[PDB]
Write a protein that binds this ligand. Structure first.
Ligand SMILES: *[C@@H]1O[C@H](CO)[C@@H](O)[C@H](O)[C@H]1NC(C)=O
Ligand SMILES: *[C@@H]1O[C@H](CO)[C@@H](O)[C@H](O)[C@H]1NC(C)=O
Ligand SMILES: *[C@@H]1O[C@H](CO)[C@@H](O)[C@H](O)[C@H]1NC(C)=O
Ligand SMILES: *[C@@H]1O[C@H](CO)[C@@H](O)[C@H](O)[C@H]1NC(C)=O
Ligand SMILES: *[C@@H]1O[C@H](CO)[C@@H](O)[C@H](O)[C@H]1NC(C)=O
Ligand SMILES: *[C@@H]1O[C@H](CO)[C@@H](O)[C@H](O)[C@H]1NC(C)=O
Ligand SMILES: *[C@@H]1O[C@H](CO)[C@@H](O)[C@H](O)[C@H]1NC(C)=O
Ligand SMILES: *[C@@H]1O[C@H](CO)[C@@H](O)[C@H](O)[C@H]1NC(C)=O
Ligand SMILES: *[C@@H]1O[C@H](CO)[C@@H](O)[C@H](O)[C@H]1NC(C)=O
Ligand SMILES: *[C@@H]1O[C@H](CO)[C@@H](O)[C@H](O)[C@H]1NC(C)=O
Ligand SMILES: *[C@@H]1O[C@H](CO)[C@@H](O)[C@H](O)[C@H]1NC(C)=O
Ligand SMILES: *[C@@H]1O[C@H](CO)[C@@H](O)[C@H](O)[C@H]1NC(C)=O
Lengths: 124, 456, 456, 456, 124, 124
């Protein structure tokens, strides 16, 4: 499995972006995708998460309404649409993928995969 | 797959098809519940009450910690290998354990590494003085403390400290602590002998905080539309990670799922309705929710799940097998389907699906006002279907309905069908009915045995 | 009808005869519940908490309204006829619905007409400032408004507004709203997917008002001696008629029944007692409550009813059929009655009816002090009856009882009776017992098949 | 006794042996609950609310007293004898009563003698003004009085009497009384038709005192380590001894048991695990808790008891009989044990006992890191046992475990065993399965009847 | 079905009256009877209700203890006994009869019958 | 059945004693034993109780930690060990034995046996 993020860069505050993660291999139709970001001087923080069908999404309350996420199982991609970026939104953004598991609430060693990360920055 | 329009004549009607959806892939967040409140604002009127309280409350935390230490020090990190990284568990010392419980033992060790960061805040944990307070775990990370009764102390006692005497202030405090303990025992008393298990629903853990689980979830900072459904399917759960007898706080790890649909699976609800046979009213006895996966038919114990208007939400897979004699009903051999006699006065006698009525018109005054003529069933017919091709609007009791058109076979009101055997469902009747069968078999068995023996 | 004195020898005793009474002809009264309190007395310390609250509470009322709009706007008043007056329902648009649900749809429309009068008071509803207030619907009619938390705000927060800081006042308010929502979700959360139904018991609806259903009933203004019985039998119920997302109030219509007796019907309770057979103690397995209607015998699922000291109160008819093999027990064929082996140490061994004791004296030291001689049963007798013809006062264990005289056959202690087959009632035993029977049948079936096939 | 290693191959594993312990020899202490609070501190703002309250509360205590007067005045002390001393009961007047109920009648009379001492303190009872107060019954004895709502009045209303208006103070009092009644009815309402019985758990009685049963127990003055266990096992109970409609207080007698172990008795828990047969996964259906007494095997309905980590606590003996066909499973005849087909995706597939794993390796990736070779079972083996003779450490899923050594037969992995008949446990399946068996029997019976009749 | 009220008139305040409603036909043994009154300038308000056997009664709290109701299945009549009438009690009294129904809490178009009404007035 | 207490006497305040009750007959292995004391001018008050196996004990809160009780089924005796006796502890101590019963919470006329009692006193 390999993931690659794309479409970062600089925007003016209040600007918008369409960060796009692309996948590889046929297995893509079963993975819970999501995004984590790392502001300088902070631990990696959660942003958004999306089921296999795209019908269910989960997100940090700090970005409620501000951000929205979608997936395309024909292109094998995940899109994050950002609006009205504040200066605090500057971070490295990482694409995240995780195989679907049910039954037990914990699953030892469940294989995560991470993208390469891409840069987002905001000018006042 | 299943043969609706044959199945319908024995008093069943097609209900709403629902998608089947379940828990998956939970996220984790760690929070501290502090069980003893802070009283330094009015310490001179606490007297001895806090020493008696600690003496009791220690007596119910110590059995929990004792059960948790087992996994917490009979496990190690793996060393001497790089092909795998993980724990190793001392099975010889653990002795007897279930597979789920062993798995939660791994999660506990995996979490314990993070809980030890919170353990450094011990001086600040003791110094909280609001119902919710936010602490810096590091410059990088924050933990929330939820305090048991700090609002009641801050709101009722601290203001009245001058008007009420010191004695009655102490007494009005004692009652509150005792009330809280009277509630807490129903979760953290002897019923919680296996605190390593990771399946305790968060509404139970929240009894350590007056049941205000809404704040205990608001502090997580997650947002989703599913939030009411994940709550009510009991899918959100908290595991006890650590406990400290010197300061009376527990650290719980909260697991927050995201839902998934299951492909090519759906649940078909069936609406029952009574029907005529001979002169008697009958109800066919078949499972009211039929679960189809990849066109396999199987039986769901739906009481474990939430039946929303569009989909069924389950905290885990709850399919169960079906007897092949029963399956033959659903694939259309109506001779198999058991039926119970109707002897109550009120039981449903019509229903609507796709705008077509199915009606037991021997027992309700079916008619249609477009002509004013009655509708009547002869004793050969179990039910009538009514649709706008026979008459556009119809009356039942005094409900007045306007009708669609039926999509299936045109002759439905003229076929009749081979109805199956009678059965009685009461548990005391079953306890009789097995014995009656056994006596009947025994008379038959004695015939064969004698004929084989005496006339060999 | 049923043969008490034969039935008695197998360990059964005649209980108290109870009249059968049920719900009928309910009255209706409409009331408004306002879910968000009024805070204008101390608005400067509310901050943002009221905006977050409305944002969440709106999220749980919108699914209710959406489910209710279906019947509320897909129906019309009938026109073009005078022989009948009523509504007409767009069955084509409703699609799938049960008979009970369709009936509630008519009641909802019938009630919506009156609810629109209350809808004009919208300006006053928003201006309430007490837990209970009375409003003039018109000069001719009045409606009562119940506010969720106005007493707590008026009693604890409004007085202390000067001593507690503004921040802590706001926080002490937040906890109350959050606590209230944490409770409310169990009734109005996803479990309430069919708000059109009119069967929700008023104790549930009252959760929107702190569960103080006593005031919610007192405001109705009805009085009757049955009030405690109607409450506990779950016969009082409330239907949601309207909801308004701009002001967060719901209008509920309360139905108040009046009880009615059913003619020629009664429930006969049977008291079980263990008895001796061989050296083993046994208990006959028969339904503990026998319901007789017009001399027909049927089985009642009494768990749904209130067993008062003189009559049974049910919210609806709960009769169920009985296997004819079991009925034979009650009409005197004791050979049919199954019995379970006693293996516990403590189980009832005597009972009193009409002042005569029935006792399993092989296991209890039956004796009578009028002569000091012990009473003993031989292995041939299942039970002994004791009355003042043998001795006036008797002792069991160390209880001393004075006895009446038996009205039946004089030879009860000497007749004896034909006891039936043994049965085991545990659910796991049944799952084993069915298969064991099937294996036994299969060995028998193969005999017939072979003789018919190979030796035709 | 039971054959663990044969029983193990069908998917069962030896659980923790637990001691069997039950209630015995309870002590007694008497306490008074006063249901109406005292308001003389602020009487000028009570208005009519106290008259309406008394009018309603009297309506729920009068039915209790009426039911209790029966045994309280239809019994007398024995006179005219010295060989025995005790009461005598007017069985003619009592009419119909169960053995347990009659026994409670004696305890009530025995207690009434002491209750009459408390009855002289009537003037002090009415003058209480705290939530808990201690009264001198005599110079030799003391009784404790618990008041329903005195803390709320003393803490919220009495201080704010100057800031809140008199009208709103009265209204804020009314809501509290009404809330309390709304809760009380669930215990003392019509569900309490047999107040003479002595089995009502103290958590229920404590609803008359805000449910703060912790203080109601603290006042007894007893101390023991079993206190948390006696509470949760429902062994502590309180009986209503007296009631007085002129002052609204009830006297309850509290029974406090001491636990006792039962000799030569223990409960063996069995851990189930799925196993392979053909290509299908199966689960054996046997009772999960086996109770052994004096080497007799019987079935316990464990839902009535508390399963602590070391012993089972029951408020009474709960053994039940077992079918001999099932017993044969436990004594080693595996052909008898029924099994149900597995159709859910997640079900337990391994377990640990005495440090040896039992695993259904056809469904889990069993392997050993000591060599890296996988472990595989052929279709002939139901389960595999893993111990340090085959591998010192093993991996399941990704759990890594270190293993002990098996004490039984060395060839466990190569023997195999004769598995039993398939069974289905769903209640609707059973209702179909009984009829299907009956139809099959009937076709067989008609063969015998015809051959005997027509070809005699 | 026909109902007829009788015994109305004028009484001194604090007086008493015995309003009597009479029925017709054999079906009288199963009808829930009751009374409604219409005070001038007010909606018709509920007064009392009685089951078929006369063993169960229900009434407005405003008349608790003041009024009592009874029925006689042999005469086919319903009697309302009023005590200590106050000036506000003046109203037209209507006899009401309603067939017994159970099961559902609502019954569409349940046929209800009303009497002819009679006058009651009180003088101070 | 006969019971006999021994080891009483006088001790200085803060002292200790070992009151010993002895039994007779083979039936001693099933009797719930216990102690009651009668302070002058007070009703007989409960002190401690012990099951047949000695694994379970119960006692008044007023003596918690202060007193401990044990039994020996081979010697057929019950031992009460008292520490730090206060002046109020002076009383006559009675040994008590009661046959084990279960099932019902009350048992009419349950035969109870009492010892002969022994004196205990404390000097300040
Ligand atoms: C409690 O005392 C601290 C220290 O004086 C103070 O900051 C806090 O406001 C007090 N709490 C209240 C409710 O007054
Ligand atoms: C784990 O730690 C506790 C506390 O020190 C101790 O009681 C326990 O024996 C330890 N585990 C083992 C296997 O010794
Ligand atoms: C009957 O119902 C169908 C919908 O199923 C509708 O299209 C058709 O027009 C209706 N016909 C009449 C005569 O009502
Ligand atoms: C089996 O069916 C016959 C009718 O064919 C019926 O008479 C009999 O009671 C049934 N027996 C059982 C045990 O169901
Ligand atoms: C709230 O304010 C109103 C006036 O706006 C006042 O009449 C009322 O007394 C206040 N509430 C309380 C509890 O004092
Ligand atoms: C009628 O019901 C539909 C379905 O919920 C809704 O969308 C619509 O707003 C309602 N009102 C009108 C006037 O159509
Ligand atoms: C026996 O009981 C009856 C009541 O059933 C009573 O009339 C009769 O006098 C009693 N006789 C004796 C001797 O007690
Ligand atoms: C049927 O009865 C016989 C005794 O007549 C008994 O041995 C057998 O176990 C019983 N079988 C079943 C399935 O009840
Ligand atoms: C109530 O009144 C008594 C005097 O009758 C007084 O001693 C007591 O302090 C008052 N209660 C409170 C809470 O102040
Ligand atoms: C005895 O019991 C009856 C039955 O409840 C009761 O009417 C009576 O008042 C009681 N007391 C006396 C002295 O009869
Ligand atoms: C195997 O386990 C036993 C404990 O059951 C232990 O005594 C023995 O040393 C172990 N042997 C190996 C090789 O691990
Ligand atoms: C009995 O067992 C046979 C196989 O031996 C099976 O085909 C049949 O369905 C079973 N019937 C019942 C009623 O269990």
């Amino acid at each position: 499995v390999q993931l690659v993020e794309s479409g970062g860069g600089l925007v003016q505050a209040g600007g918008s972006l369409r960060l796009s993660c692309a996948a590889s291999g046929r297995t893509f139709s079963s993975y819970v995708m999501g995004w984590y970001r790392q502001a300088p001087g902070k631990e990696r923080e959660f942003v958004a998460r999306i089921s296999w069908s795209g019908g269910h999404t989960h997100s940090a309350d700090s970005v409620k309404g501000r951000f929205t996420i979608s997936r395309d199982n024909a292109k094998n991609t995940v899109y994050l649409q950002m609006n009205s970026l504040k200066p605090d939104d500057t971070a490295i953004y990482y694409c995240n993928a995780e195989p679907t598991v049910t039954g037990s609430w914990f699953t030892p060693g469940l294989q995560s995969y991470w993208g390469q990360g891409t840069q987002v920055t905001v000018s006042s | 797959i299943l043969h609706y329009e044959k199945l319908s004549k024995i008093g069943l009607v097609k209900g709403v098809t629902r998608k089947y959806k379940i828990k998956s892939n939970p996220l984790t967040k760690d929070i501290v519940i502090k069980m003893i409140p802070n009283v330094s604002n009015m310490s001179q009127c606490t007297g001895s009450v806090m020493e008696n309280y600690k003496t009791r409350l220690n007596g119910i935390l110590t059995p929990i910690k004792g059960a948790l230490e087992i996994y917490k020090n009979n496990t190690h990190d793996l060393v001497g290998d790089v092909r795998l990284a993980g724990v190793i568990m001392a099975g010889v010392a653990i002795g007897i354990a279930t597979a789920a419980q062993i798995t939660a033992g791994v999660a506990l060790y995996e979490a314990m590494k993070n809980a030890d960061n919170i353990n450094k805040l011990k001086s600040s944990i003791e110094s909280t003085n609001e119902a919710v307070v936010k602490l810096q775990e590091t410059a990088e990370k924050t933990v929330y403390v939820l305090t048991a009764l700090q609002d009641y102390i801050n709101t009722n006692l601290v203001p009245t400290i001058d008007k009420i005497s010191c004695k009655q202030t102490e007494l009005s405090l004692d009652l509150a602590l005792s009330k809280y303990l009277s509630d807490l025992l129903f979760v953290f008393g002897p019923n919680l002998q296996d605190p390593v298990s990771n399946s305790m629903t968060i509404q139970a853990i929240s009894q350590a905080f007056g049941g205000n689980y809404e704040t205990l979830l608001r502090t997580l900072g997650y947002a989703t539309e599913d939030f009411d459904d994940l709550l009510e399917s009991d899918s959100i759960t908290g595991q006890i990670i650590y406990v400290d007898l010197s300061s009376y706080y527990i650290i719980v790890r909260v697991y927050f799922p995201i839902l998934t649909e299951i492909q090519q699976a759906y649940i078909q609800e069936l609406l029952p309705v009574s029907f005529n046979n001979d002169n008697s009213e009958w109800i066919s006895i078949v499972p009211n929710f039929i679960l189809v996966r990849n066109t396999l038919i199987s039986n769901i114990e739906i009481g474990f799940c939430l039946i929303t208007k569009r989909s069924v939400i389950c905290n885990q897979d709850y399919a169960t097998p079906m007897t092949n004699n029963m399956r033959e009903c659903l694939t259309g051999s109506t001779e198999k389907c058991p039926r119970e006699l109707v002897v109550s006065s009120h039981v449903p006698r019509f229903a609507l699906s796709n705008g077509v009525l199915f009606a037991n018109c021997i027992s309700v005054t079916c008619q249609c006002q477009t002509t004013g003529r009655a509708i009547s069933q002869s004793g050969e017919q179990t039910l009538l279907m009514i649709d706008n091709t026979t008459c556009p609007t119809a009356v039942l009791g005094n409900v007045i309905i306007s009708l669609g058109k039926y999509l299936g076979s045109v002759n439905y009101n003229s076929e009749g069908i081979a109805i199956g055997p009678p059965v009685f469902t009461d548990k005391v009747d079953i306890s009789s009915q097995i014995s009656s069968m056994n006596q009947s078999l025994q008379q038959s068995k004695d015939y064969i045995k004698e004929a084989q023996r005496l006339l060999d």
